[PDB]
Amino acid sequence: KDQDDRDHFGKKRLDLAGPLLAQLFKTLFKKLTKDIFRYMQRTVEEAHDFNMKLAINAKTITSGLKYALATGNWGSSRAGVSQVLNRYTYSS
Amino acid sequence: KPMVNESDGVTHALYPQEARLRNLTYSSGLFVDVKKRTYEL
Amino acid sequence: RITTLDETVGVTMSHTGMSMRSDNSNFLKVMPKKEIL
Amino acid sequence: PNLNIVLTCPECKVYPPKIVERFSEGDVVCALCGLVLSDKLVDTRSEWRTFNPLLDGNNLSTRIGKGETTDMRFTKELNKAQGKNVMDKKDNEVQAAFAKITMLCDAAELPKIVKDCAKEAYKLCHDEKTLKGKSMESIMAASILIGCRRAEVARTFKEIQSLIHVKTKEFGKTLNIMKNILRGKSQNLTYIPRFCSHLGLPMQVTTSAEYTAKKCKEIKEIAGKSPITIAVVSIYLNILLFQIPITAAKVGQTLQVTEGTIKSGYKILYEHRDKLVDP
Ligand SMILES: [Zn+2]
Ligand SMILES: [Zn+2]
């Protein structure tokens, strides 16, 4: 048998917004859970009252999605993913 | 659905035209049913 | 599929941040010297 | 000692420099005899292209993080060295205080202007003698409320109280002496659209409660008994004028107001119903 070809297009997989936002939302969700648990351990360890507004933050998901879809990086791993739409003509 | 929360505190529906004119971000809010339990074990 | 809440937003957005409603759920709330001698 | 360069025209010498600055040619010229005053003009926009004194001051610092090709042992030794020199300056409280205040403001969904005003207020107070404690919670809550009052925003005491348990009384004293600090370093209408947003009411009911709020502020009688009850009874009347039904229990449990208070204000308000009609 010949050496396995890597240029075969069938062995290649493309990634649209689905997989990218799956990785991104996955990591951001993990960080969210870790931070919430950190607030839980701080609450039970320092012996105080609990609050739902200080445990679950929204700027981690908002800053993660807004920052990743705002800049070219998808977090340098990946760059040049997001580009400004070219409105020179319709075929462009 | 897509929405916008302004500076004074009012949140209304967003359209892509007004999103482009006001330099906003066309996004939608996300909620989660968070369940809590306490075991004593 | 994911269910889209159809309300007037302002109610849910009011329940997000400060809504003047706290508590409502219990979770992570936690001499005479001779006689003494 | 002097060090002030003043450009004058030796040929004109008839008036202080009333000159013109030619940026395209890079010169500055007297607008009278047309004689140039200086060549090779520097720019401020061009040096700014590559790149906070209001809060950080003139202090400089640089981070040490891991490198492309480095060892994890050296990264820890450099960070532990900075951990021993962190006591040389008492500015660790400003970064941690601004971090927790950042978390609370980000939790309250307030704009960045109120965040910067609150950080500026906490920087004005910081560690003075008249503060004398308050366990860092009351100066943060009171600083957020001050930054809210400065940015023309409206947040009730029960809202920040719902965020932070400051025991109200000590919060009021710390807010009072803090206001004295601000005075030593030298409006209910905004609440209506917020509660109308909490109830999801149309714009006509919002501006109707605006005119009702102003008129009720002009009629006197009761005067206020805190503006919150005036707001909730004003919205209660403006919503009993139309047909959208909420009753008194739902609006009393949503806005956290007593039913007997909105009915007590609805009585005299119904008595003054005459002069409150806009159209
Ligand atoms: Zn001298
Ligand atoms: Zn001249």
The CATH number of the domain where D208 resides is what? Answer: 1.10.472.10
Q: What angle do CA D124, D130, D131 make, to 5 degrees?
A: 70
For D125-215, list the strands marked E by DSSP: none
Residues 6+ apart with CB under 8 A from D188: D154, D213, D217, D224, D227, D228, D230, D231
The experimental resolution of this structure, in angstroms, equals 4.7
- B10 interfacial to chain A (CB closer than 8 Å): no
Q: Nearest CA of chain B to the CA of C21: how many Å?
A: 17
Placement of tokens 């601004």 in the chain: D98
Which of B13, B8, B6, B10 is closest to B28 using CA atoms? B13
Q: Report the residue of A32, A53, A57, A76 to disrupt the D interface, i.e. the one with the largest count of D CBs within 10 Å.
A: A53
- B25 interfacial to chain A (CB closer than 8 Å): yes
3-state DSSP assignment of residue A24:
helix
- Cα torsion angle, C15, C21, C22, C26, sign: negative
- C10 interfacial to chain B (CB closer than 8 Å): yes
Does A53 sit within 8 Å of D103, measured CB to CB?
no
* Residues of chain D found within 8 Å of residue C20, distances taken between Cβ atoms: 156, 158-159, 162, 255-256
> DSSP per residue over A23-83, as a string?
HHHHHHHHHHHHHHHHHHHHHHHHT----HHHHS-SHHHHHHHHHHHHSS-------S-S-
Q: Which ligand sits nearest to residue D1's alpha carbon?
A: 1
| Calpha distance B3→B15 (Å, rounded) | 8
Element of type H or E holding D20: strand D19-22
> How many alpha carbons fall within 13 Å on the CB side of residue D71?
3
Which of D136, D106, D276, D133 is closest to D208 using CA atoms? D276
Q: Do residues C20 and D256 touch, judged by C-beta distance below 8 A?
A: yes
- Known binding residues of D are 9, 12, 30, 33
Q: Ligand 2 centre from D41 Cα, in Å?
A: 18
How do D27-30 and D19-22 pair as beta strands? antiparallel
Does C28 sit within 8 Å of A50, measured CB to CB?
yes
* Residues of chain B found within 8 Å of residue C5, distances taken between Cβ atoms: 31
Does B34 sit within 8 Å of A65, measured CB to CB?
no
Does A57 sit within 8 Å of D103, measured CB to CB?
yes
Inter-CA distances, D77 with A48, D61, D71, D74, D224, Å: 35, 18, 11, 5, 63
Closest residue in B to C27 (Cα) is B38
| Amino acid present at D241 | L
* Residues of chain B found within 8 Å of residue D203, distances taken between Cβ atoms: none
* Residues of chain C found within 8 Å of residue A51, distances taken between Cβ atoms: 22
| Calpha distance D263→D265 (Å, rounded) | 5
Torsion (CA) C10, C12, C16, C21 in degrees, nearest 10 = 90
| Calpha distance D157→D145 (Å, rounded) | 8
| Amino acid present at D218 | E
- D162 interfacial to chain C (CB closer than 8 Å): yes
Q: Nearest CA of chain C to the CA of B21: how many Å?
A: 22
For chain C, the 3-state helix, strand and coil shares in percent, each to the nearest 5, are 30, 0, 70
What experiment produced this structure? Answer: cryo-EM
Please give the structure tokens belonging to residue D1. Answer: 């000692």
Which range marks the domain in which residue D206 is found? Answer: 190-271
| Calpha distance D40→D28 (Å, rounded) | 9
Q: Nearest CA of chain A to the CA of C23: how many Å?
A: 8
Q: What is the CA radius of gyration of chain C?
A: 26
Placement of tokens 């936002």 in the chain: A21
